[model samples]
Structure formats: structure tokens, C-alpha cells
Target chain A: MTSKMSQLERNIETIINTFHQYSVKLGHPDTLNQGEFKELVRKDLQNFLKKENKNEKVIEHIMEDLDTNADKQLSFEEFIMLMARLTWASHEKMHEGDEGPGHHHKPGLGEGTP
Target chain B: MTSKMSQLERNIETIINTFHQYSVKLGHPDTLNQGEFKELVRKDLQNFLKKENKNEKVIEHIMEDLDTNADKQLSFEEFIMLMARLTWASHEKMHEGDEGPGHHHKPGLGEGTP
Candidate 1:
């Protein structure tokens, strides 16, 4: 980075690079297999999803939900959905005890406008 | 953070906090008016969207596209959609010059699973 990047831009880079870091661990460089995803949830998401690392069943359930294409591996695009939801949840948690409006807001998809 | 948070978790917090920082600057504390959104793009997305900050017409066009609800303002959810797209674009740029598969993968939204 010759010039300094902004905070939000840096955050985006962090997200992209974080995905690459785990995805490039093994198998296809573009996607994360079960083991890679497990490790990511274990190491990189300890605070947010700590239980997932300990319980294989929980990890499998999460994998099933995130792997929308039914593929065994998770592409970066798929992984982003998880990140976005977690971020939204975190935002709401700060405001209330998760009892606020549960309206689903999926951004990248064509459904929810805002 | 009493204990150290993971890089990915911290990144998510950065995104959430950044959005709040801008959204809280104006009328609705949950959304950004045109001015607030413009300020955010100009100050926080300088490297990635520098041209947008300079040109008012360009900003208006972007606002139109991002403001999917046609409300003339931007909510956090809507803003996140922009972030996801930009992040994906940046990822592709690192791989090949932008001539890659233009397949749209809208996460969060119901359309694209991944």
C-alpha cells in the first residue's frame, strides 16, 4: 500500500484477505472444504462462534447452512454471507439483547433493498 | 475487548462501528442521509472510491443505485450491500484484471446462495 487506505477500505481488505488465508490452506485455492472452514471458525471466530470449534455436529450444521449450492466446499462468496449475518447480529446485540426486530436483511442478494 | 479478539472478529467490529460513526452524524441514527453518505464515501473510502467523492453527479448516481428503497437515504443494510460488492470486486481484481466471470453472487439476499 503506497498510500494509506481508509478504515472501511482496510476493513474490506481484512475480510477479503481473511477469507483467502483460510481458503488457501488446502484443497481448492478458491474455496474452503470442511476442515478449512472448521479451522477458520475455530481459530478466527473464537469469540463469536466458540462452540462450533468444540462440537463437530455444530460445525456440520453451520456448513450445511452456509453451503447454499450444496457443494461440500465453501466459496468466498458463500463465506461472506456468514460474515454479513454475524456483523448484523453483532450490531443488533449492541443495541438490545437480540430481541429487536428480527427482520432479515440480506444485502448482496436482490431481495432486501436496505 | 477484555480479551483479544480474532482478526476477523475485529474486522467485523470495525465495519459495524464505521457504519455507526457515519449513520449517527445526521437525522435518523440508524441511517445516513445523502450528505452523511457522501461524507463517508469521501473520507472513509478514499482509495477505493475517490472519484465518487469529487463528483456530485457520480455520488448522486451511486446514491440512487445503493438506495434501493428509493428513500433517498442509506440504511446500514443497504450500505453493507455496497461493501460486499466492492469487496468482491477487489478480490477479483487481485486475481485477474476484471475480465473474469461476472456472475453476480448476492449474499445475505435470498437469490445467490453463496
Candidate 2:
């Protein structure tokens, strides 16, 4: 049990270290400024579009929604949150199909399923 | 402000609902068991390999490390946490470099960067 907990901790630590590596050079607020955030989204969009080769329009629409500041960049925190949200969204879309579309907004629905 | 709050709430809801969808089919504990966890890792490995096309041995090596349970699937909560950790990890790897490796585990390292 102790080892399991340790492993989890180590895994988390490794992740943090990696983020710091690429981001450390940008120098505060700038390295992770608005432009940075857009870059992340741009990458996701490219990946999704390239993979599906379809949804170019949907990806563009979603990118507009996520751009938020319209500065053409996103902060590190925003990028992370966006990812967290996207991961959840992708799973829903993959499994729930049509029914799960907007369900993520509802609360107190039930205990749990996943 | 209200709209922003609503958007955030909706995002969270979508995440919850999606988890419930595919997970709903397999019966409690079964739909999300050790086997399921292994399966998720397997898919990840395949994708990672298919993309970079390298580290076949490393992928196998990591899979061994992640198995956790000799059983198979990881619980939903466990899976979500795994993702949270991974998103964090991937970012860290992309930026922080070596110095930031274990920083996430350290906490209170400073104010905050990412």
C-alpha cells in the first residue's frame, strides 16, 4: 500500500518536472501568457483534425470558444484546465454519443458510473 | 460572470455524464475493473507507438510499471486521477526539464508557475 502511494506520488512529480522544463525559459507571465495558451489549443486542433480529417469546422468553432481572451494565446493554467475539460469531453463523445453531448453540465444526477 | 460560472459548471457536468455512459453498460465493478484499466493502457501504448513509433520496449516497460493490479481494470476515479497526473506530466516534460521533475510532489515550491 505504501509503495502504491509512493508510485502515484512519483508519477505526479515526474509530470510537474516536465512542464517546468519547457515553460521555465519564457520568463513569468510571458512564457505562459495568452499566446502560449493559443498554441496549445492550436496543437490540439491540428491533432484532432489530422486524425479525423473531418470536423475542421467544429474544431474551428470550438477554438473560437476556447480562445476566450482573443489575444491569440492562453495562459498555462487555462491550457491545463482546457485539457482537463477536453479529456472529459472526448470520453463522453466517444461513449455517450448523442445523449452525452451536454450532460456534462448537469449535476446531482446520481451517484457515479465511470 | 454568471455565464462563465455556468460554462464551467456545464463542463464539469459533461465530464460526469460521459463517464456514466459507456461505464453504465458493464455492471458495477465489472464495467470498470482491473481488466479495463489494462485495456486503457494498452490503447495508449498502441497510439504512442503508432505515433512516435519508438520505445516499444519502453512502452512495454511502463505498462509493466502501471499494471498496479495483477487483476486488470482501474476504477473510474483511479482512471481520472491517472489522466490528471498524465496531463500534468506531459506538460512538465514539454517544458520544465530536469529541475522541475519532482516539483509537483513538493508543493509550496513557490507561489506558482503552471
TM-score of each: 0.64, 0.31
**How far out, in Å, is residue B86 in model 2?**
13
The segments of candidate 1 whose C-alpha lies over 4 angstroms from its true place after superposition are A1-3, A26-28, A51-62, A68-73, A93-114, B26-28, B51-77, B92-114
Evaluated on CA atoms against the true complex, candidate 2 attains a DockQ of 0.04
All DockQ scores: 0.24, 0.04
Tens-digit lDDT track of model 1 for B1-114 = 444467877787777777768887874357667887787777777666664556877777766687877788876666766675666556654453235555643222111222
Worst 10 residues of 1 chain A by lDDT: A105-114
lDDT of 2 by residue, B6-111 (tens): 2222333444344434344466422344343334334432232222224445434333343455333444433454444454434433444346465443121111
Interface RMSD of each: 10.3, 14.3
- Candidate 2 lDDT over residue span A1-114, tens digit each: 222222222333343343333345465432333343334333432332233324455444444455555654343443444544554444434444346455543212211223
Off by over 4 Å in 2: A1-22, A29-31, A38-73, A93-114, B1-114
